[PDB]
Design a protein around this ligand. Structure first.
Ligand code: CL0
Ligand code: CLA
Ligand code: CLA
Ligand code: CLA
Ligand code: CLA
Ligand code: CLA
Ligand code: CLA
Ligand SMILES: CCCCCCCCCCCCCCCC(=O)OC[C@H](COP(=O)(O)OC[C@@H](O)CO)OC(=O)CCCCCCCCCCCCCCC
Ligand SMILES: CC1=C(/C=C/C(C)=C\C=C\C(C)=C\C=C\C=C(C)\C=C\C=C(C)\C=C\C2=C(C)C(=O)CCC2(C)C)C(C)(C)CCC1
Ligand SMILES: CC1=C(C/C=C(\C)CCC[C@H](C)CCC[C@H](C)CCCC(C)C)C(=O)c2ccccc2C1=O
Ligand SMILES: CC1=C(C/C=C(\C)CCC[C@H](C)CCC[C@H](C)CCCC(C)C)C(=O)c2ccccc2C1=O
Ligand code: SF4
Ligand code: SF4
Ligand code: SF4
Lengths: 739, 63, 74, 139, 31, 74, 80, 31, 134, 39
């Protein structure tokens, strides 16, 4: 039947399973039939280009609809009080009352309010008219087309790169760090200085006049001469009004180190200075390696080195890193499993900053965009993080070679994995018995009308982090809270230029920069501790035990994702390392419930001014149930009440939507295959024995879903209901109040 | 090994790997894995006995 | 809680839990607190039985308290 | 110390003390409860906040409870460890685990008051840990 | 208030260029 | 109109509960998938991953599934 | 379809062949001096993959495995 | 230029799935 | 093939369209006495005193039935595979001996002369068209 | 049984492990010293 061209086995399948299983491993080039290592890399390299095009085409969409179906030019004149528009609605199913509701934000038709915050993004960067966004739209279409042609090109025979070109790792680090990180960082400071800084100060700089118009009056003489201090002489005053010349300055690089008073965002001059210093280090960082010329470091020599200055040493830090270089390059899953974890951490790193140190203008007061953006990235931080271990396990099952390592550091971990998995269990158990019991003791105690008897304990040493930054509120009088300390007044060089403006930001209380921590904040971080320790326990176990266990030693022979080993030996229901991932994803979603409910409820008290309700009622779990979920769900469930319909009708429908999608998954998780297969056989009997419908017949024999793909379908159902339900509640609860 | 002794097996993919068990009988024949061993701890299947080779067994204690 | 605790046993499988107990048994044989009765994960049908017991107990007990506290006020 | 005040001077603490809701049969349990918590630190809400930093001024919060636990908990582990080791020397091991040999257990339960001394004795020279080689392990 | 009509039709014509190349990249990958 | 719907909802949940329970009774002896189901017993987890998977094919597991529809119906 | 591989740790207990529902396994004579019988899997096409053979094996780990693979009408147990 | 939505929306909802599922159903059932 | 059909009224559990367009299986047995036996797919049936023949959809029903026949002290049960073109093949006791018993004629097939631990690693066998179980 | 599942090659004092761990511990007390206002 030849549908799966990549596999002959599935093509020679009379059943329906070929259609489902073919959808899965169409992206698994390693399993594709007759795939050499050269064609594998060459096929991967072209796929990246098609992926990059989808990104830029998606970015072109955001710029087009706001230009054609948006209110950016109106939003600039009053950003705080004007709602930003994402795009327009056209649904034939709508009735006249619905169109009346969705006609909002001063539009002539049914329209959606934007919550991505991208209206604040490009406004800070120098866009001031809809035409400027349209040029970005058509630019990215051509920019995307440039990559799609490159992907087709490198699959042609003469332009197909060789295997050695892909494994030239020392070269790629040199260009990416210096060029992709550095020059791109250096360029972005150019746009900030030429386009953003003047247009924030009022001067219209564009393609017509950027060659003529000067960013700084003194020009490039201070730079090339070396008297760099001129560029930081006249800064923007505190009374500067954005996109105007009132209270403006001439400085292009400064180190004010704080929030702009008006926008409640970071000083844009610092961002120009910011990317400059980074691009310098990155370019400097790039030249480490031995690309072609001989000058530089060889990773293989450094990792295989067994000789310090005089002593004979096992390796770096006296640890054997003998065969890790070949392991990294030769196995792509090691690279992918590694790079995802590095990116997964960075994704959370983004989220943790953007609410505290908002870069773009007026996002701090667009409370809904702050919440959606935070919940966005940390959810994505998981899949990258959870996805890292899934590939780290596949590497141990498919690409790992013990003979190559042979005493490597990686060999040692497999040798004492039992201590790793065991101690993780104690840490998870040690947290949950206590984090729950304290939540429960405080919950029962308040139920009996004695709230004084709760176990409230202050996050003591956590203030010491805030007290080492300022934050006089606590009274610790530590390093930066202490004016006389050495770090406050740098003894050799009194150049603490960040300290005056930075201390004003923390000690203001309005911004979300290092907010106050209380006893309720204590217990939640330990719940977050329990989520991350346990989520690793599942994933670390699955990876290290992917190769074998006493119950199923020959696990490597079967593969990463096999259903089971059979009923014998007491039962083998989830032995496969794939099933470790399957159970891990349930936790990681739960953690963000513990993170985002903490984020959302803590900020709602601040945005509303009622900080006390969280500081008091977050101790007992009924508060999270009552004060956060019950109270804030009022406007959502009333989105379409019997009397009328408001603008929040979509979220209520989406709220009940993901509820159903959450539970339809429970069928596939709870109910398993063998019950359904017999049920299918009865339907096969009837259709083959109906009087008229006997004419039409299946070409592919109907078969109940396999054990593994049922677990797959259940997760997406569990997750899609998880994501959609909270997004509808998060946005509606914030949008209905608008603070 | 002589009957009645205790031996620590070093067979990977074995439940009693790196565990001691008494040798119950030996077969004076050309059969591979001639030795017969009995362990106090049971398998997941509850078998409690399995035959092994001479090289896998090391004499922990005397008969 | 008891309802959600049910979902441990319904979604999961015996194969994972036995391997986790194996690593935990190592720490005991290390410190010589090894149990004479060798520990084993729950049987398959038991894990299904344990789940539905909690799924119904945590489910019925909820509406039990909601019916009581609501109607007793009125 | 963080955003708190001494409870004895905190007005919110005194406001709750007038309505203490006596717990036990003792009528003065409510006033007695607030009286003894006059030492600790309360916040703006008026509820006491413990400090587990380790300050000797406030060691009764966590430290004294900490030491009292570990002496009790190590009693349970040393007793269980010794009772299990004693069984293995005997023949019928598994049955004794279910049907406890109280003749063996109660002498062991009589000990355990000095479990730290027995612990260091086994640590410095003894059987606190088995060798990694003799223990079973997956491939 | 909004972008001109003529600018919209131009963007659609430009969108054919990624499309014709997206088809070429995809069909080449299947081979 | 509200009672026309809910009374049909009750019949819907009841019929499905009978479907799960009645199926286990008839197919406990044998099935097209497994013809020797009686020898395995009333309470067995499965017969193996083969045949695409024979999970929850026993008379016991039908009762386990039906108990969830008891809760959904009542 | 499915493959059934047998290893040196056989002992000729014959509990595997008795447990097979489709008669995929046969017993053949071991020419060596191990025993007069060692298992085989000639009619491998009719293997459904129910793992009953593995549950009946008395070895510390299996002398006979069942590595799943390409599915057919016979392996999937379809009577239609 | 709001009339474009009246043409492009239903093409996505009807013409795209019909044509794609039609070709695919024949492609998967081919021999 | 020759024999009598067991006497039963019929049932939904039985042969489907696979028998016409694909393989169908048949089982023979000879009983000294007529007793009631449970069929592979539901129901009960009587068996004549000589040369009982039954058609079954798959091979699994026959051996499952043969195990039931062994309870009634019957061992001369044979299974045939009938293709749509009428080609019949005598299979289950391929020789006169049963599979559990040993016979000199048979040969070992896919026997790995090693322990399971001695199988190669999967990384050692990649992009080669082989597997660890070889 | 190509490679042993247990490591070897160390001696009772463990100078390298303690030297680095004690450094990590020395920093932890320095941070605590600033908190307790010892410095
Ligand atoms: C934020 C997360 C959250 C979560 C996960 C839950 C979860 C739950 N709540 Mg809760 N709620 C939450 C927030 C919440 N609740 C409440 C107020 C509340 C009340 C009063 C009750 C619950 C009930 C329940 C539980 C259902 C009982 C059960 O048997 O389990 C699993 C449940 C099932 C398997 C049954 C499925 C649910 C059905 C039957 C509801 C559909 C009704 C619909 C009209 C019928 C459609 C037709 C038929 C064909 C289904 C469930 C565990 C209890 C309950 O019994 O509801 C059924 C209950 O009485 N909740 C409030 C306001 C204070 C908030 C903020
Ligand atoms: C019967 C119920 C129903 C139906 C059929 C629709 C239908 C629609 N609504 Mg809608 N809506 C409804 C109820 C409904 N609504 C209700 C109750 C509300 C709340 C009041 C709304 C609120 C609402 C808003 C606010 C908006 C819509 C919009 C739309 C349109 C989206 C069309 C589109 O972009 O392509 C289809 C969309 C897709 C995302 C594609 C499918 C996505 C799947 C999951 C992934 C795709 C890959 C796929 C799985 C692979 C297979 C296919 C492949 C082979 C091609 C569509 C006409 C939007 C609109 O005006 O159109 C632009 C819009 O902005 N609706
Ligand atoms: C970003 C880099 C990246 C890359 C290159 C890969 C690449 C790969 N992964 Mg991987 N993975 C990643 C990230 C990545 N993954 C992440 C982030 C995770 C964590 C979730 C995983 C988890 C993971 C697992 C658990 C497995 C893989 C596997 C694989 C391989 C096969 C993929 C496959 O079967 O087709 C992809 C097939 C699909 C069906 C994908 C689409 C399915 C989504 C979930 C449907 C969602 C439904 C719908 C669209 C939503 C509707 C919305 C609603 C409102 C209407 C392939 C090499 C598999 C393998 O065998 O590796 C060798 C495997 O077992 N990966
Ligand atoms: C980033 C997303 C992405 C990318 C880059 C790829 C890339 C690839 N997949 Mg793939 N896949 C994906 C997601 C992706 N997949 C997802 C989500 C699934 C579902 C789980 C699959 C399921 C899948 C299967 C089942 C198979 C592939 C295969 C392939 C490879 C062959 C080319 C191909 O798809 O046929 C080209 C596909 C087309 C549909 C041709 C038309 C091109 C696009 C779709 C339409 C463009 C026209 C435009 C809309 C109209 C306007 C222009 C007009 C004016 C001309 C290639 C490496 C095949 C393979 O065997 O690999 C070798 C294969 O069998 N994939
Ligand atoms: C995403 C794209 C999309 C679009 C654009 C539409 C559009 C429409 N749907 Mg629809 N639908 C969709 C997806 C979509 N649907 C999906 C995914 C579902 C599944 C839930 C549904 C389920 C659905 C239902 C259940 C119903 C609709 C109906 C309708 C129509 C209501 C218009 C109105 O106000 O009342 C009607 C106003 C009129 C002026 C009369 C309409 C006359 C029809 C549309 C003429 C069609 C001519 C036809 C194509 C001729 C072709 C012949 C040619 C091929 C030879 C409208 C045409 C309703 C309807 O009855 O439409 C007839 C209706 O009952 N839809
Ligand atoms: C200067 C030369 C140079 C440059 C610019 C690149 C650039 C690139 N190469 Mg490349 N390459 C080079 C030399 C170079 N290479 C050489 C010499 C070799 C041979 C050794 C290779 C071999 C090679 C391979 C084999 C592959 C690439 C790939 C890629 C692409 C990675 C995907 C991407 O867009 O990441 C963009 C990344 C960044 C912009 C920076 C890192 C991400 C950080 C987190 C962002 C910065 C933080 C900031 C806050 C973000 C804010 C966002 C803003 C919107 C708010 C990228 C276009 C891959 C690809 O996609 O295929 C086409 C791929 O598969 N290259
Ligand atoms: C609310 C539901 C819930 C709860 C409470 C747990 C709890 C736990 N899971 Mg878990 N899990 C759940 C849902 C849940 N899970 C779901 C839906 C899945 C997806 C399948 C998983 C998947 C999963 C995996 C894959 C793993 C866990 C693990 C764990 C344990 C982590 C150790 C720990 O932190 O100890 C804290 C323990 C608790 C807080 C519960 C202790 C019990 C109470 C508080 C005390 C008992 C006294 C009792 C009330 C009185 C008896 C009365 C009488 C009637 C008998 C813990 C027991 C991991 C594990 O066991 O490793 C150690 C592990 O590997 N779970
Ligand atoms: C800077 C430290 C330089 C370490 C220099 C180095 O690599 O030494 C490595 C050396 C280990 O040598 P090895 O034992 O690996 O091999 C030496 C042979 O004699 C082995 O038999 O350790 C020591 O010198 C002991 C003291 C280290 C104490 C480290 C603590 C540092 C705390 C600060
Ligand atoms: C040569 C050369 C030099 C001359 C330099 C001159 C005289 C000009 C060079 C200018 C450069 C190097 C311009 C950079 C062009 C790339 C641009 C302008 C666009 C990048 C846009 C991207 C990537 C996408 C942006 C997006 C879009 C489109 C949006 O609209 C929204 C935001 C976002 C989504 C990010 C000097 C004398 C120095 C030294 C001698 C050699
Ligand atoms: C219901 C159910 C079935 C039966 C389900 C079947 C046969 C699937 C029927 C669904 C049809 C195919 C419609 C689904 C259409 C989807 C909405 C879209 C899917 C198409 C994507 C490729 C886009 C199982 O086979 C099963 C197996 C193991 C554990 C649990 C279960 C289980 O719960
Ligand atoms: C968690 C879990 C387990 C593991 C669960 C276990 C091992 C439960 C153990 C319960 C108790 C706590 C064991 C110990 C009881 C002690 C005797 C108690 C000590 C005595 C004092 C309390 C007096 C499975 O075996 C399983 C199997 C199949 C599907 C799902 C699952 C599943 O989810
Ligand atoms: S999933 Fe079902 S068939 Fe597979 S081992 Fe578990 S109980 Fe047996
Ligand atoms: S059951 Fe296994 S070990 Fe025993 S004779 Fe058969 S194949 Fe060999
Ligand atoms: S899986 Fe089934 S058919 Fe195959 S050898 Fe084992 S018992 Fe026989």
């Amino acid at each position: 039947t030849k549908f799966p061209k990549f596999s002959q086995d599935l093509a020679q399948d009379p059943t329906t399973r070929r259609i489902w299983y073919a959808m899965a491993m169409g992206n698994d080039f390693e399993s594709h039939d007759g795939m050499t290592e050269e064609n594998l890399y060459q096929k991967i390299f072209a796929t990246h280009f098609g992926h990059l095009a989808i990104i830029f085409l998606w970015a072109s969409s955001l710029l087009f609809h706001v230009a054609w179906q948006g209110n950016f030019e109106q939003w600039i004149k009053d950003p705080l009080h004007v709602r930003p528009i994402a795009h327009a609605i056209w649904d034939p199913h709508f009735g006249k009352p619905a169109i009346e509701a969705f006609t909002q934000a001063g539009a002539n038709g049914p329209v959606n309010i934007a919550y991505s915050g991208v209206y604040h993004w490009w406004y800070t960067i120098g866009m001031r008219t809809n035409t400027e966004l349209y040029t970005g739209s058509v630019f990215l279409l051509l920019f995307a087309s440039l990559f799609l042609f490159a992907g087709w090109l490198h699959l042609q025979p003469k332009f197909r790169p060789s295997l050695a070109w892909f494994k030239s790792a020392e070269s790629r680090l040199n260009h990416h760090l210096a060029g992709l990180f550095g020059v791109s960082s250096l360029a972005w400071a150019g746009h900030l200085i030429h386009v953003a800084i003047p247009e924030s100060r009022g001067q219209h700089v564009g393609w017509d006049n950027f060659l003529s118009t000067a960013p700084h009056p003194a020009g490039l003489q201070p730079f090339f001469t070396g008297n760099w201090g001129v560029y930081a002489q006249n800064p923007d005053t505190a009374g500067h009004i954005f996109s105007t010349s009132q209270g403006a300055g001439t400085a292009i690089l400064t180190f004010l180190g704080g929030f702009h008073p008006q926008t409640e965002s970071l000083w844009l001059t610092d961002m120009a200075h910011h990317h400059l210093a980074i691009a310098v280090l990155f370019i400097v960082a790039g030249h480490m390696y031995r690309t072609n010329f001989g000058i530089g470091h060889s990773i293989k020599e450094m990792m295989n080195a067994k000789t310090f200055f005089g002593k004979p040493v096992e390796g770096p830090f006296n640890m054997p890193h003998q065969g890790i270089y070949d392991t990294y390059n030769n196995s792509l899953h090691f690279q992918l499993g590694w790079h995802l974890a590095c990116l997964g951490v960075v994704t959370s790193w983004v989220a943790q900053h953007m609410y505290s140190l908002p870069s773009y203008a007026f996002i701090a007061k667009d409370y809904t965009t702050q919440a959606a953006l935070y919940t966005h990235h940390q959810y994505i931080a998981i899949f990258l993080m959870v996805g890292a271990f899934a590939h780290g396990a596949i590497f141990l099952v498919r690409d790992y070679d013990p003979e190559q390592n042979k005493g490597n550091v990686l060999e040692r971990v497999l040798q004492h994995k039992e201590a790793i998995i065991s101690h993780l269990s104690w840490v998870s158990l040690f947290l949950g018995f206590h984090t729950l019991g304290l939540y429960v003791h405080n919950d029962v105690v308040v139920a009996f009308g004695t709230p004084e008897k709760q176990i409230l304990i202050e996050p003591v040493f956590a203030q010491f982090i805030q007290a080492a930054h300022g934050k006089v509120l606590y009274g610790l009088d530590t390093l930066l809270s202490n004016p006389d300390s050495v770090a406050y007044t740098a003894y050799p060089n009194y150049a603490n230029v960040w300290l005056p403006g930075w201390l004003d930001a923390i000690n203001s209380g309005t911004n979300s920069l290092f907010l106050t921590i209380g006893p309720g904040d204590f217990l939640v971080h330990h719940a977050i501790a329990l989520g991350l320790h346990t989520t690793t326990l599942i994933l670390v176990k699955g990876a290290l035990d992917a190769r074998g266990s006493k119950l199923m030693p020959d696990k490597k022979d079967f593969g990463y994702a096999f259903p089971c080993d059979g009923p014998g030996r007491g039962g083998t229901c989830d032995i496969s390392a794939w099933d470790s991932f399957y159970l891990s994803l349930f936790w990681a979603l739960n953690t963000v419930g513990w993170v985002t409910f903490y984020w959302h409820w803590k900020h709602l008290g601040i945005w509303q001014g009622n900080v006390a309700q969280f500081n008091e009622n977050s101790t007992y779990l009924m508060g999270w149930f009552r004060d956060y979920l019950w109270a804030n769900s009022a406007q959502l469930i009333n989105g379409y009440n019997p009397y009328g319909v408001n603008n929040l009708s979509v979220w209520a429908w989406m709220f009940l939507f993901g509820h159903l999608v959450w539970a339809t998954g429970f069928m596939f998780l709870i109910s398993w295959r063998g019950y359904w297969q017999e049920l299918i056989e009865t339907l096969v009997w009837a259709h083959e024995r109906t009087p008229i419908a006997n004419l039409v017949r299946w070409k592919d024999k109907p078969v109940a879903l396999s054990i593994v793909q049922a677990r797959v379908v259940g997760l997406a159902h569990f997750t899609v209901g998880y994501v959609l339900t909270y997004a509808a509640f998060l946005i509606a609860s914030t949008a209905g109040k608008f603070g | 090994v002589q009957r009645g002794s205790k031996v620590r097996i070093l067979r990977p993919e074995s439940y009693w790997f790196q565990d001691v068990g008494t040798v119950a009988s030996v077969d004076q024949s050309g059969i591979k894995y001639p030795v017969i061993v009995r362990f106090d701890k049971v398998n997941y299947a509850g078998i409690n006995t399995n035959n092994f080779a001479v090289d896998e067994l090391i004499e922990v204690e005397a008969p | 809680f008891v309802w959600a605790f049910s979902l441990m046993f319904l979604f999961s499988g015996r194969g994972y839990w036995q391997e986790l107990i194996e690593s935990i048994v190592w720490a005991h044989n290390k410190l010589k607190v090894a149990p004479a009765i060798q520990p084993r994960a729950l049987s398959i049908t038991q894990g299904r039985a344990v789940g539905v017991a909690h799924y119904l107990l945590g489910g019925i007990a909820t509406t039990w308290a909601f019916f009581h506290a609501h109607i007793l006020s009125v | 110390g963080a955003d708190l005040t001494p409870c004895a001077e905190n007005p919110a603490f005194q406001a709750l003390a007038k309505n203490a809701r006596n717990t036990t049969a003792d009528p003065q349990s409510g006033q007695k409860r607030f009286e003894r918590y006059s030492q600790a630190l309360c916040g703006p809400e008026g509820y006491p906040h413990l400090i587990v930093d380790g300050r000797l001024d406030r060691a009764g919060d966590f430290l004294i409870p900490s030491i009292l636990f570990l002496y009790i908990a190590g009693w349970i582990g040393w007793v269980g460890r010794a009772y299990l080791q004693a069984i293995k020397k005997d023949s019928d091991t598994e049955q004794k685990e279910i049907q406890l040999d109280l003749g063996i257990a109660l002498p062991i339960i009589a000990t355990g008051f000095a479990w730290p001394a027995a612990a260091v004795k086994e640590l410095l020279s003894g059987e606190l840990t088995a060798k990694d080689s003799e223990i079973t392990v997956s491939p | 208030s909004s972008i001109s009509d003529t600018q919209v039709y131009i963007a659609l014509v430009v969108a054919l260029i990624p499309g014709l190349l997206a088809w070429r990249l995809a069909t080449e990958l299947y081979k | 109109t509200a009672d026309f719907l809910i009374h049909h909802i009750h019949a819907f949940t009841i019929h499905v509960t009978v479907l799960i329970l009645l199926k286990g009774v008839l197919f406990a002896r044998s099935s097209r998938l497994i013809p020797d189901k009686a020898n395995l017993g009333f309470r067995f987890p499965c017969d193996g991953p083969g045949r695409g998977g024979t999970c929850q094919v026993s008379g016991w597991d039908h009762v386990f599934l039906g108990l969830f529809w008891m809760y959904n119906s009542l | 379809s499915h493959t059934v591989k047998i290893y040196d740790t056989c002992i000729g207990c014959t509990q595997c062949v008795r447990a097979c529902p489709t008669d995929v396994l046969e017993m053949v004579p071991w020419d060596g001096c191990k025993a007069a019988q060692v298992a085989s899997s000639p009619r491998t096409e009719d293997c459904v993959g129910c793992k009953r053979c593995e549950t009946a094996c008395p070895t510390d780990f299996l002398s006979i495995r069942v590595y799943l693979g390409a599915e057919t009408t016979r392996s999937m147990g379809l009577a239609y | 230029a709001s009339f474009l939505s009246s043409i492009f929306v239903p093409v996505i909802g009807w013409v795209v799935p019909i044509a794609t599922f039609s070709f695919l159903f024949l492609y998967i059932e081919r021999e | 093939l020759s024999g009598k059909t067991p006497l039963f009224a019929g049932s939904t559990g039985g042969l489907l369209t696979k028998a016409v367009e694909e393989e169908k299986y048949a089982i023979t047995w000879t009983s000294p006495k007529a007793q009631v036996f449970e069929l592979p797919t539901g129901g009960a049936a009587t068996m004549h005193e000589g040369e009982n023949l039954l058609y079954i959809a798959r091979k699994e029903y026959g051996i499952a039935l043969g195990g039931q026949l062994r309870k009634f002290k019957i061992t001369n049960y044979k299974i045939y595979r009938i293709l749509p073109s009428g080609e019949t093949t005598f299979i289950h006791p391929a020789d006169g001996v049963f599979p559990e018993k040993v016979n000199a004629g048979r040969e070992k097939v896919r026997f790995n002369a090693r322990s399971i631990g001695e199988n190669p690693n999967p990384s050692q066998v990649k992009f080669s068209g082989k597997a660890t179980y070889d | 049984k190509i490679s042993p599942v247990a490591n070897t090659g160390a001696k009772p004092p463990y100078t390298f492990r303690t030297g680095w761990a004690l450094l990590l511990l020395a920093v932890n007390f320095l941070v605590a010293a600033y908190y307790f206002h010892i410095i």
